Design a protein around this nucleic acid. Sequence first.
DNA 1: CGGCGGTACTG
DNA 2: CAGTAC
DNA 3: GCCG
Length: 327
Amino acid sequence: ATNHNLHITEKLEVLAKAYSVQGDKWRALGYAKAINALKSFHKPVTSYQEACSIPGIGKRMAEKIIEILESGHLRKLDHISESVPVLELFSNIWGAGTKTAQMWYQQGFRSLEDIRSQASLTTQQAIGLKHYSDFLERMPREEATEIEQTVQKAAQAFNSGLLCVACGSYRRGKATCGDVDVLITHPDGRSHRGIFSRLLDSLRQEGFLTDDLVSQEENGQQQKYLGVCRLPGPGRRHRRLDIIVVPYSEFACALLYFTGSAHFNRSMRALAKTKGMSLSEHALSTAVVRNTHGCKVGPGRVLPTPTEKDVFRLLGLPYREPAERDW
DNA sequence: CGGCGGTACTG
DNA sequence: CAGTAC
DNA sequence: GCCG
Ligand code: NA
Ligand code: NA
């Protein structure tokens, strides 16, 4: 598609990012939805009524849209706190969100050097600070492929039958990727067990993993690593790498979840809800059991889904290719 | 108005 | 319980 | 912020 409302969405994005770094996440979310709708719209917007006809745009958003349309400017931008660019700087540090960014700003910090010299830093934030510039850039998908191959080769050394796939924006076919998520399972349903620890050990020993952000997260039968890798060779940057090992029966739903996008996942959860189902990285399930007072007592029952297509089918949806899952 | 996932780790 | 990122 |  093509954006016919550029000067409008450019302005809205400024406002959206301001709300985000100030921690108004719900308001930012609503802006994101409206901003999407505007770009993928058959025409430039020429009236308030037309703006409101668009799902995701109500009175308040339409008002701003038409103000921009007519005057070329959005006044609310002129009343945006001067702190916003610094809050964004601080929250670009992996492990620091808006609360930490506020705290540092109130302490009078203004720069990364300020943070590096005088800020108290969590173990994760120190790594995120140390690799600030590397983590901010998106890598070419070619480099993501090499990263996936590195993980896959070290995994298949333990069991050649392991199935390994890079998810996220890479699987959605983007030219560049902010990170790499490598999802690992085994078709025999059992031989994924034991792999996670040995795999991280092997990647450690050969120098590929340079820092761990979360060395192990256990979520049901899924194991997740969040860390930092760097391919061999000179001129290589540090990159964010996640590794998730899952049982074969959850592979389709894990695959879907880690392929995303985040916005696509949110809309699929909403759709499942309408059908009295829930959708997680583990399973498509019937909705949980709620008692007399409306509180969840027990989990629902899993609807088995061997493949991503099975998930879409049970939801009464046409299959969507990963490249079509940005929204 | 409340929901817009729920979750693990960590403190 | 709250902060963060998935 | 928007939606029901
Ligand atoms: Na609307
Ligand atoms: Na951050």
